[PDB]
């Protein structure tokens, strides 16, 4: 119920209209991030770098796994 | 069917509860995780699909495998063992920095967090085009969905022993809300004497029948086939602002404009609406200057009195009359002047509340004075 | 002990004075600069410690040395001299761009500026993990300190002749402020008839005894051990908002919510607080629909009346009662309705100030009216 | 000379009109496009200048040619054919992502859009220094212009047959506005009893003779020779705030100060203005603590009473008196206390408007009261 | 006319003044983004990758070209 | 003294409390950004590029060095 006649008297006009569309998600897919590379053909030239890489990953992975396990333990079968 | 143990949980928001329960349906069971672990330990590609029995495929992405396969392995016989380790360590630490950026303490409530596919770009190897292709996400709506951050992922499983994260990703489908129209509003300044004013209105408004609502364009992409929003863009508009858009000109606030202002004319319905007191309007057909009467605030130019008009050094040919000739200022009720600066608002609100606090006793006795 | 010559300096803020005076204990003297310059010329590694005899260690970082050592030098025989120069020139120009971005005119007041270690990441070679390792910055507090940008660098010396910049970097130590609790506030909508309202409260508030203040979370990281902030997060709350949080419901503002709202129920202390007039609440134990009386605005669900409750398609088992049964609307004093949009605020403030201006003579003569 | 057909166009913004007319002047004609197309099919360099008869020079930029020339072609004889394709495909997909980011649906109106040269960095090969050099953009104003993002580009032609985009780019010339001075305002806190207060003023203000206006610094770079702005930085200041800056201290809003505050003293004209009730001020020359009288809100320290003064653990030598001795609180009119938080503003405005509409009948009938 | 005297009584001082400069554009230059690389010395090793790249570029180039042609068709000679 | 009882009557609850920790700096370390790379093993292959790199660095380093020297000249020994 926009009054375009009054609005144009103070310098307001419409310059375009469009429909409104929202998003709903029905199906889901699985995407896994493989954090450990295959280094078989590097003939153990990257032992020290990989070991430090795994050490750094645990400081991030462990808190998320704890948060995930905290909610999962409160979910029980309906019966 | 599962039940949430509220007493043990204690406190949880609606988003946490909804995301926690959905974790029972979107999470691979213990057998599928064990099967996934074995399959991951046999692949050497950056992007690869894992097929497991009668289940939807799991797309495995390794963030530094392209560099290992394309850069390090071919140079294995040429570079020394020490140099090979130094180059991979540089990429591993840079990959960790992006993992920490995305999944570290900056991530608030990982259970309920929804991460866009663009935020995952570095974790997926620096690009998302092949990931989208391998997931089957395509069609005529892909650009609109992608630009509004419609593709989102949820964390469903973190495996510390084998170092992988399982995400749940969905390609959304678009549904048009029936009867909702999003309007784009543009303004032209006007002059009251020597002062140039400008009506304050929202950039976008939404209507549904006789309802008028605000519209947030932050999560929306304006496509030629309709605006596409990944969140809810409609939020309520105050009654005073709704009065303005319904025809009450005295309910619309106005503000002063700077010296150099870019909106002093507009083309609307084939007619030119110009603040001819602040720009030079000249009729090109007859060569005469169009003068704005000081008792008018705007000029509406149509082909009846000026078929071709020069407005700002730009020559425009206008169509037939669609806006009536300008009315006098005394037939227009103008709204209150405002200043939209943050510190101008606080300075003026403080002055206003100080006056209300000084006259508190008189305002309390609103019935002891009227009934006397 | 040094003295600032204020008369010669003329004008300076407290930050410039404090940073300027600090640029006498943290700045290497003329002999240490000469030793550093000669020592820098002999190194060829990306990250190097200097060990200037009985002095604190200096960490030298060269931004493109890894590329030269790992990519260019090994391929010196294979590649032509012209190609080697072109490849290094690409990295040099990109490195210069980041130096200009960090230390150029966009840097306001270089002496007083504090630069985070993350902002220096490209200047340090694209990663800071190895720099942090060789500075000795480690521990359980590192993750929280790093994420809230607690590690800051300060410009100390610029050497134009040898082209190096000396920075002063410090690893902060954490300190609990005794008695300060940071509270996270969450809300649920409620219905007055058919309209759905929502109380406007801050996301975080801080208390110290009987004091209530606002909390700015922009520079804070919420760790399991506590909130870690790199700036001062406490700033005062207005008395009206403090009255709201102290029990006065009439002092709390409220807003209208949109059609799709995700805060229509919450789990708190084992009980479920649900709107139940804007969502469907059903008691799963008995199968009956929980109806919200129009004279009530909220529903508090406990195990005494419904051990297991289905809300919004989610089945939740609740504990014993810890919230009383909802009181009627006539027993609650509701606060003023507001709209939090910028343009809604300005439109309404302009209307309010116009009314105050149109009644200036009435309000400035309150003493005369009250006496008579 | 061209004319816009406004009847066929129907609706157009002033910016869209001006940009559309400028297309006729800045767009290469059909013959020049065909000549440009053939020239682009003979070059193999990342950056190349095209000479086209007696016309302007066109600079051609290819975004992945440095990688092909420096990385792929030299290793063509030592890598498999599939490997060469895989490596280039990684760069092509990443280049497409930046093209889509820049020229995709997120670009609202391509015709009137002005893209900065820094936003084009990846499309130009990852760096703009060589592009600027080959365009001839150099001088003493380059750093200020570049930092303000003053170098802009406009889309003038898109060729889908041969896959290239023509952009119109300009190097601006700086012009000083006569009589405009930009002032930087700095404040210190003061104590009224035990409460620490802070005057709320803009960070920057601009004056032109007797005119005072706000100053927006978002598009401005503060260079030693002046302030360089790529947009209009001047916008009006509300009359109440102009009253503050013109001498009316009662028109200046004030706010409470948190526990830790870094603006408790300042050096101005060789004198030290300090809140000595909130920090410790000691006269170093005499060893006497400088005490602030509770009937005074600030302390003005000059050499006539304390040649060398210690504040906040900093020793400062001050000059002759430039500020009078502090005046009593009862001779200063203070402004209204405000809170600048977004939610504090809405809460207090809602309370104020509720009071005004509870006295709607009283305020409207003010002439029947003043007459009696 | 800033009153520095009264402003200092409530703790406000000026700490620096500067002139104000704005930007004006006199001439324009042409800059063409060549989206197709020269792959002549790469033989046929990149045929599949280039074809995908060209296909992806069209989904972006065509909408921009149509918007440009919409404006240009409304620009007529003053004759 | 937050009144949780009255806040719940209008739909406001507390969902978590935490302690507050601030940062203070005790000691400082030195970090020097070495802007000149060692190019000895590259022979004379990078003379032109290094000269242009040094010229560009001057336009950034000189203004900062001047700002640093301006403040240091005003700092005097206490005696
Ligand atoms: C498009 O634009 C036009 C012009 O802006 C709008 O017309 C205005 O409409 C409003 C709302 O009706 C009018 O305001 C009302 O005017 C009535 C008549 O006022 C006479 O007396 C005053 C003297 O002070 C003259 O200035 C005026 O010209 C008239 O001669 C009053 O009766 C109203 O006051 C009372 O209204 C109702 C009573 O039922 C109650 O709310 C209160 O008692 C209130 O006091 C009110 O002031 C306004 O005058 C019109 N302006 C004009 C004609 O210039 C159109 O409404 C707008 N179109 C739409 C669809 O909204
Ligand atoms: C938790 O929340 C509850 C309910 O929200 C709060 O209770 C409110 O407390 C306030 C402050 O004590 C009460 O406000 C005062 O109530 C008085 C009640 O008297 C009658 O008022 C009308 C008259 O018919 C009736 O509707 C009402 O039921 C009472 O019978 C009023 O007299 C007061 O009026 C004030 O007016 C002006 C102030 O502008 C003064 O000049 C007057 O002297 C007087 O102070 C005032 O309104 C409020 O009524 C209570 N709400 C109820 C009972 O529903 C609790 O205080 C709160 N707990 C905490 C710890 O904060
Ligand atoms: C790292 O990558 C290597 C390859 O470079 C992986 O080894 C490969 O694993 C695959 C997957 O099982 C093997 O394919 C299988 O081969 C048998 C025939 O022997 C067949 O029955 C199966 O259907 C399947 O195709 C492949 O042979 C094997 N290749 C080599 C050279 O070993 C390896 O597992 C990875 N190692 C890790 C991640 O530690
Ligand atoms: C660029 O890098 C080279 C190395 O690639 C630097 O040369 C190195 O210089 C240092 C110090 O001048 C030498 O180390 C010293 O060696 C002597 C014994 O010769 C010893 O007494 C010292 O304790 C110290 O270790 C180092 O041997 C030398 N290396 C080589 C290969 O020459 C060079 O200085 C760097 N910078 C330039 C050229 O600007
Ligand atoms: C890709 O790049 C190659 C070069 O790597 C381009 O071939 C080059 O084409 C130009 C123009 O046709 C040749 O220059 C011309 O040379 C003649 C003398 O023969 C002279 O009359 C002209 O004034 C001009 O300088 C250049 O020699 C030639 N180079 C080679 C090695 O063939 C090729 O056109 C590009 N192909 C594409 C983009 O498809
Ligand atoms: C600089 O500051 C001083 C003091 O803050 C300003 O003096 C103030 O001037 C205003 C208006 O001239 C005075 O208000 C008037 O006061 C009288 C006396 O009651 C009354 O009849 C009027 O209705 C009105 O309220 C104000 O009292 C006065 N301040 C004090 C403390 O007496 C001075 O004007 C400022 N200078 C400039 C150039 O603005
Ligand atoms: C790593 O692999 C190499 C392959 O060359 C082989 O000696 C062995 O498996 C490992 N060597 C060491 C030293 O760990
Ligand atoms: C390129 O041509 C060769 C034969 O010349 C053949 O492998 C195929 O047609 C192409 N190969 C690739 C990897 O594209
Ligand atoms: C480097 O030295 C060689 C040998 O004299 C010379 O040919 C070349 O031009 C020099 N300069 C370079 C590669 O910049």
Short mmCIF file of N, CA, C and O in Angstrom, two decimals, chain C residues 150-227:
data_model
loop_
_atom_site.label_atom_id
_atom_site.label_comp_id
_atom_site.label_asym_id
_atom_site.label_seq_id
_atom_site.Cartn_x
_atom_site.Cartn_y
_atom_site.Cartn_z
N UNK C 150 46.30 -10.80 21.22
CA UNK C 150 47.00 -10.25 22.37
C UNK C 150 48.47 -9.99 22.15
O UNK C 150 49.05 -9.18 22.88
N UNK C 151 49.08 -10.63 21.16
CA UNK C 151 50.50 -10.44 20.87
C UNK C 151 50.64 -9.25 19.94
O UNK C 151 50.17 -9.28 18.80
N UNK C 152 51.29 -8.20 20.43
CA UNK C 152 51.37 -6.92 19.74
C UNK C 152 52.82 -6.54 19.48
O UNK C 152 53.69 -6.80 20.31
N UNK C 153 53.06 -5.94 18.33
CA UNK C 153 54.38 -5.45 17.96
C UNK C 153 54.35 -3.93 17.85
O UNK C 153 53.34 -3.34 17.46
N UNK C 154 55.46 -3.31 18.22
CA UNK C 154 55.59 -1.86 18.24
C UNK C 154 56.84 -1.47 17.46
O UNK C 154 57.90 -2.06 17.65
N UNK C 155 56.71 -0.47 16.58
CA UNK C 155 57.85 -0.03 15.79
C UNK C 155 58.82 0.71 16.69
O UNK C 155 58.44 1.62 17.43
N UNK C 156 60.09 0.33 16.61
CA UNK C 156 61.13 0.85 17.48
C UNK C 156 62.26 1.54 16.74
O UNK C 156 62.74 2.58 17.19
N UNK C 157 62.69 1.00 15.60
CA UNK C 157 63.78 1.59 14.84
C UNK C 157 63.60 1.26 13.37
O UNK C 157 63.30 0.12 13.02
N UNK C 158 63.78 2.26 12.52
CA UNK C 158 63.76 2.08 11.07
C UNK C 158 65.13 2.49 10.55
O UNK C 158 65.59 3.61 10.80
N UNK C 159 65.77 1.59 9.82
CA UNK C 159 67.10 1.83 9.26
C UNK C 159 66.96 1.94 7.75
O UNK C 159 66.71 0.94 7.07
N UNK C 160 67.12 3.15 7.23
CA UNK C 160 66.97 3.37 5.79
C UNK C 160 68.19 2.90 5.01
O UNK C 160 68.05 2.42 3.88
N UNK C 161 69.39 3.03 5.58
CA UNK C 161 70.60 2.70 4.83
C UNK C 161 70.72 1.21 4.57
O UNK C 161 71.14 0.79 3.49
N UNK C 162 70.35 0.37 5.55
CA UNK C 162 70.45 -1.07 5.41
C UNK C 162 69.10 -1.75 5.23
O UNK C 162 69.06 -2.98 5.09
N UNK C 163 68.01 -0.99 5.24
CA UNK C 163 66.67 -1.49 4.91
C UNK C 163 66.24 -2.61 5.87
O UNK C 163 66.10 -3.77 5.49
N UNK C 164 66.06 -2.23 7.13
CA UNK C 164 65.42 -3.13 8.08
C UNK C 164 64.63 -2.34 9.10
O UNK C 164 64.91 -1.16 9.35
N UNK C 165 63.62 -2.99 9.68
CA UNK C 165 62.76 -2.41 10.69
C UNK C 165 62.87 -3.24 11.96
O UNK C 165 62.76 -4.47 11.90
N UNK C 166 63.10 -2.59 13.09
CA UNK C 166 63.18 -3.25 14.38
C UNK C 166 61.85 -3.05 15.11
O UNK C 166 61.38 -1.92 15.25
N UNK C 167 61.26 -4.15 15.57
CA UNK C 167 60.00 -4.11 16.28
C UNK C 167 60.20 -4.62 17.70
O UNK C 167 61.10 -5.42 17.98
N UNK C 168 59.35 -4.14 18.61
CA UNK C 168 59.31 -4.61 19.98
C UNK C 168 58.03 -5.42 20.16
O UNK C 168 56.93 -4.88 20.02
N UNK C 169 58.18 -6.70 20.47
CA UNK C 169 57.06 -7.62 20.59
C UNK C 169 57.05 -8.19 22.01
O UNK C 169 58.11 -8.43 22.60
N UNK C 170 55.86 -8.37 22.56
CA UNK C 170 55.70 -8.87 23.92
C UNK C 170 54.63 -9.95 23.97
O UNK C 170 53.61 -9.86 23.28
N UNK C 171 54.88 -10.96 24.79
CA UNK C 171 53.92 -12.02 25.05
C UNK C 171 53.19 -11.68 26.34
O UNK C 171 53.82 -11.67 27.41
N UNK C 172 51.89 -11.38 26.31
CA UNK C 172 51.20 -10.94 27.52
C UNK C 172 50.93 -12.10 28.47
O UNK C 172 50.90 -13.27 28.09
N UNK C 173 50.73 -11.74 29.74
CA UNK C 173 50.31 -12.69 30.76
C UNK C 173 48.90 -12.34 31.23
O UNK C 173 48.54 -11.16 31.31
N UNK C 174 48.10 -13.36 31.51
CA UNK C 174 46.70 -13.19 31.82
C UNK C 174 46.49 -12.96 33.31
O UNK C 174 47.26 -13.44 34.15
N UNK C 175 45.43 -12.22 33.64
CA UNK C 175 45.12 -11.90 35.03
C UNK C 175 43.61 -11.85 35.20
O UNK C 175 42.94 -11.06 34.53
N UNK C 176 43.07 -12.70 36.08
CA UNK C 176 41.65 -12.63 36.41
C UNK C 176 41.36 -11.37 37.20
O UNK C 176 42.05 -11.06 38.18
N UNK C 177 40.33 -10.64 36.79
CA UNK C 177 39.81 -9.52 37.57
C UNK C 177 38.83 -10.10 38.58
O UNK C 177 37.79 -10.64 38.21
N UNK C 178 39.17 -9.99 39.86
CA UNK C 178 38.43 -10.68 40.90
C UNK C 178 37.02 -10.11 41.04
O UNK C 178 36.83 -8.89 41.11
N UNK C 179 36.03 -11.00 41.09
CA UNK C 179 34.66 -10.62 41.30
C UNK C 179 33.87 -10.30 40.05
O UNK C 179 32.66 -10.08 40.14
N UNK C 180 34.51 -10.27 38.88
CA UNK C 180 33.82 -9.93 37.64
C UNK C 180 33.33 -11.21 36.99
O UNK C 180 34.12 -12.11 36.67
N UNK C 181 32.02 -11.30 36.77
CA UNK C 181 31.39 -12.41 36.07
C UNK C 181 30.77 -11.86 34.80
O UNK C 181 30.07 -10.84 34.83
N UNK C 182 31.03 -12.53 33.68
CA UNK C 182 30.45 -12.18 32.40
C UNK C 182 29.27 -13.11 32.15
O UNK C 182 29.44 -14.34 32.13
N UNK C 183 28.09 -12.55 31.99
CA UNK C 183 26.87 -13.32 31.78
C UNK C 183 26.46 -13.26 30.32
O UNK C 183 26.52 -12.20 29.69
N UNK C 184 26.05 -14.40 29.78
CA UNK C 184 25.48 -14.47 28.44
C UNK C 184 23.97 -14.55 28.55
O UNK C 184 23.44 -15.46 29.20
N UNK C 185 23.28 -13.60 27.93
CA UNK C 185 21.83 -13.49 28.01
C UNK C 185 21.21 -13.99 26.72
O UNK C 185 21.66 -13.63 25.63
N UNK C 186 20.19 -14.83 26.85
CA UNK C 186 19.45 -15.34 25.71
C UNK C 186 17.96 -15.11 25.94
O UNK C 186 17.49 -15.11 27.08
N UNK C 187 17.24 -14.90 24.85
CA UNK C 187 15.84 -14.54 24.96
C UNK C 187 14.88 -15.45 24.22
O UNK C 187 15.27 -16.20 23.32
N UNK C 188 13.61 -15.39 24.60
CA UNK C 188 12.53 -16.09 23.93
C UNK C 188 11.43 -15.09 23.65
O UNK C 188 11.13 -14.23 24.48
N UNK C 189 10.84 -15.17 22.46
CA UNK C 189 9.73 -14.31 22.12
C UNK C 189 8.50 -14.68 22.95
O UNK C 189 8.41 -15.76 23.54
N UNK C 190 7.54 -13.77 22.99
CA UNK C 190 6.27 -14.00 23.66
C UNK C 190 5.17 -13.30 22.87
O UNK C 190 5.43 -12.39 22.09
N UNK C 191 3.94 -13.75 23.07
CA UNK C 191 2.80 -13.27 22.32
C UNK C 191 1.89 -12.44 23.21
O UNK C 191 1.54 -12.86 24.32
N UNK C 192 1.51 -11.26 22.73
CA UNK C 192 0.44 -10.46 23.31
C UNK C 192 -0.69 -10.48 22.29
O UNK C 192 -0.68 -9.72 21.32
N UNK C 193 -1.66 -11.37 22.51
CA UNK C 193 -2.69 -11.59 21.51
C UNK C 193 -2.13 -12.32 20.31
O UNK C 193 -1.74 -13.48 20.40
N UNK C 194 -2.07 -11.63 19.17
CA UNK C 194 -1.50 -12.20 17.96
C UNK C 194 -0.12 -11.64 17.63
O UNK C 194 0.55 -12.19 16.75
N UNK C 195 0.32 -10.58 18.30
CA UNK C 195 1.62 -10.00 18.06
C UNK C 195 2.68 -10.71 18.89
O UNK C 195 2.46 -11.02 20.06
N UNK C 196 3.84 -10.95 18.29
CA UNK C 196 4.94 -11.65 18.92
C UNK C 196 6.05 -10.65 19.23
O UNK C 196 6.57 -10.00 18.32
N UNK C 197 6.40 -10.53 20.50
CA UNK C 197 7.35 -9.52 20.97
C UNK C 197 8.60 -10.18 21.52
O UNK C 197 8.66 -11.39 21.74
N UNK C 198 9.62 -9.35 21.75
CA UNK C 198 10.94 -9.85 22.14
C UNK C 198 11.64 -8.77 22.94
O UNK C 198 11.80 -7.64 22.46
N UNK C 199 12.07 -9.11 24.16
CA UNK C 199 12.75 -8.16 25.02
C UNK C 199 14.14 -7.84 24.48
O UNK C 199 14.88 -8.73 24.06
N UNK C 200 14.49 -6.56 24.49
CA UNK C 200 15.78 -6.10 23.98
C UNK C 200 16.76 -5.99 25.15
O UNK C 200 16.64 -5.09 25.98
N UNK C 201 17.71 -6.92 25.21
CA UNK C 201 18.74 -6.92 26.25
C UNK C 201 20.08 -7.13 25.58
O UNK C 201 20.16 -7.64 24.45
N UNK C 202 21.17 -6.73 26.23
CA UNK C 202 22.50 -6.98 25.67
C UNK C 202 22.82 -8.47 25.61
O UNK C 202 22.33 -9.27 26.42
N UNK C 203 23.65 -8.83 24.64
CA UNK C 203 24.10 -10.22 24.52
C UNK C 203 24.94 -10.63 25.72
O UNK C 203 24.77 -11.73 26.26
N UNK C 204 25.85 -9.76 26.16
CA UNK C 204 26.70 -10.02 27.31
C UNK C 204 26.60 -8.86 28.29
O UNK C 204 26.56 -7.70 27.88
N UNK C 205 26.54 -9.18 29.58
CA UNK C 205 26.62 -8.19 30.64
C UNK C 205 27.63 -8.66 31.67
O UNK C 205 27.89 -9.86 31.80
N UNK C 206 28.21 -7.71 32.40
CA UNK C 206 29.21 -8.00 33.40
C UNK C 206 28.76 -7.48 34.76
O UNK C 206 28.20 -6.38 34.85
N UNK C 207 29.00 -8.26 35.80
CA UNK C 207 28.66 -7.86 37.16
C UNK C 207 29.89 -7.92 38.04
O UNK C 207 30.75 -8.79 37.87
N UNK C 208 29.98 -6.99 38.98
CA UNK C 208 31.01 -6.98 40.02
C UNK C 208 30.30 -6.61 41.32
O UNK C 208 30.10 -5.43 41.61
N UNK C 209 29.92 -7.62 42.08
CA UNK C 209 29.12 -7.39 43.27
C UNK C 209 27.72 -6.96 42.91
O UNK C 209 26.96 -7.73 42.33
N UNK C 210 27.36 -5.72 43.25
CA UNK C 210 26.08 -5.15 42.87
C UNK C 210 26.19 -4.18 41.70
O UNK C 210 25.22 -3.47 41.41
N UNK C 211 27.33 -4.13 41.03
CA UNK C 211 27.50 -3.27 39.87
C UNK C 211 27.17 -4.05 38.60
O UNK C 211 27.49 -5.24 38.49
N UNK C 212 26.52 -3.38 37.65
CA UNK C 212 26.19 -3.96 36.36
C UNK C 212 26.75 -3.05 35.28
O UNK C 212 26.55 -1.83 35.33
N UNK C 213 27.45 -3.63 34.31
CA UNK C 213 28.05 -2.87 33.23
C UNK C 213 27.89 -3.64 31.93
O UNK C 213 27.63 -4.84 31.91
N UNK C 214 28.04 -2.91 30.82
CA UNK C 214 28.05 -3.54 29.52
C UNK C 214 29.36 -4.29 29.30
O UNK C 214 30.34 -4.12 30.02
N UNK C 215 29.36 -5.15 28.28
CA UNK C 215 30.54 -5.94 27.94
C UNK C 215 30.71 -5.94 26.43
O UNK C 215 29.79 -6.31 25.70
N UNK C 216 31.88 -5.53 25.98
CA UNK C 216 32.22 -5.50 24.56
C UNK C 216 33.05 -6.73 24.24
O UNK C 216 34.16 -6.88 24.76
N UNK C 217 32.53 -7.61 23.39
CA UNK C 217 33.16 -8.88 23.08
C UNK C 217 34.01 -8.82 21.82
O UNK C 217 34.44 -9.87 21.33
N UNK C 218 34.26 -7.62 21.29
CA UNK C 218 34.96 -7.51 20.01
C UNK C 218 36.39 -8.02 20.09
O UNK C 218 36.89 -8.64 19.14
N UNK C 219 37.07 -7.77 21.20
CA UNK C 219 38.45 -8.20 21.38
C UNK C 219 38.59 -9.35 22.36
O UNK C 219 39.66 -9.55 22.93
N UNK C 220 37.53 -10.12 22.57
CA UNK C 220 37.51 -11.16 23.58
C UNK C 220 37.38 -12.53 22.94
O UNK C 220 36.77 -12.69 21.88
N UNK C 221 37.98 -13.52 23.59
CA UNK C 221 37.88 -14.92 23.20
C UNK C 221 37.30 -15.71 24.36
O UNK C 221 37.81 -15.62 25.49
N UNK C 222 36.24 -16.46 24.10
CA UNK C 222 35.55 -17.22 25.14
C UNK C 222 36.14 -18.62 25.20
O UNK C 222 35.77 -19.50 24.42
N UNK C 223 37.07 -18.82 26.11
CA UNK C 223 37.74 -20.08 26.36
C UNK C 223 37.06 -20.81 27.51
O UNK C 223 36.38 -20.19 28.33
N UNK C 224 37.20 -22.13 27.59
CA UNK C 224 36.57 -22.86 28.69
C UNK C 224 37.02 -22.40 30.07
O UNK C 224 36.25 -22.50 31.03
N UNK C 225 38.25 -21.91 30.19
CA UNK C 225 38.76 -21.45 31.47
C UNK C 225 38.30 -20.04 31.83
O UNK C 225 38.42 -19.64 32.99
N UNK C 226 37.79 -19.28 30.87
CA UNK C 226 37.36 -17.92 31.12
C UNK C 226 37.44 -17.11 29.85
O UNK C 226 37.89 -17.58 28.81
N UNK C 227 37.00 -15.86 29.96
CA UNK C 227 37.00 -14.94 28.83
C UNK C 227 38.32 -14.20 28.77
O UNK C 227 38.75 -13.60 29.77
#
